[PDB]
């Protein structure tokens, strides 16, 4: 029913299944790394915003949830990150005033080339 909804799901499922089968084809031929899994562990950890680290520690020390209290805990973290990003879009960041917003969205400054090397 409602082919307009079925087709995108069909193609999404196709490509995602192909990705899974490719991951399987790569984990058997080339077996997984034993310790660089910690490299990827920490390097997917580092990009977690600050507003989520408050539950990360709450995830370490026992009192996480049963299964449901976190699934309403991280919701408000998502939402305050959402409104914070909205304010960074409109009124800018914490160390940035309206002149610098006009500078950034006018693309007035070049990326620093002398500091690069």
């Amino acid at each position: 029913p409602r082919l307009a909804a079925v087709m995108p799901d069909a193609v999404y499922a196709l490509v995602q299944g192909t990705h899974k089968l490719g991951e399987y084809a790569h984990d058997l031929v080339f077996p997984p790394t034993p310790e660089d899994l910690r490299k990827l562990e920490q390097q997917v950890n580092a990009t977690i915003p600050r507003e989520f680290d408050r539950v990360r520690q709450r995830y370490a020390e026992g009192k996480i949830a049963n299964d449901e209290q976190l699934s309403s805990e991280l919701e408000d973290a998502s939402f305050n990150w959402y409104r914070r990003q909205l304010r960074t879009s409109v009124v800018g960041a914490t160390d940035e005033e309206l002149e610098d917003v006009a500078v950034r969205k006018l693309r007035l400054e070049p990326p620093a080339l002398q500091a690069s090397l």
């Binding site: 070049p110 990326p111 620093a112 080339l113 002398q114």
Partner: protein, 48 residues
């Protein structure tokens, strides 16, 4: 064309040396001239 071009560099030179009076000393007869030559053609391009 001679008078027009000369007066053009004259005007931009007046504007500059009036903007920053510190290098309006004769010590810069090769410096403010070096700036006029750079400013009569366009904008000085920073490497970055």
């Amino acid at each position: 064309v001679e008078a027009a071009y000369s007066a053009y560099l004259r005007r931009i030179a007046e504007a500059y040396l009036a903007e920053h009076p510190q290098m309006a000393a004769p010590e810069h007869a090769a410096h403010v001239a070096r700036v006029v030559r750079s400013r009569a053609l366009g904008t000085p391009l920073s490497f970055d």
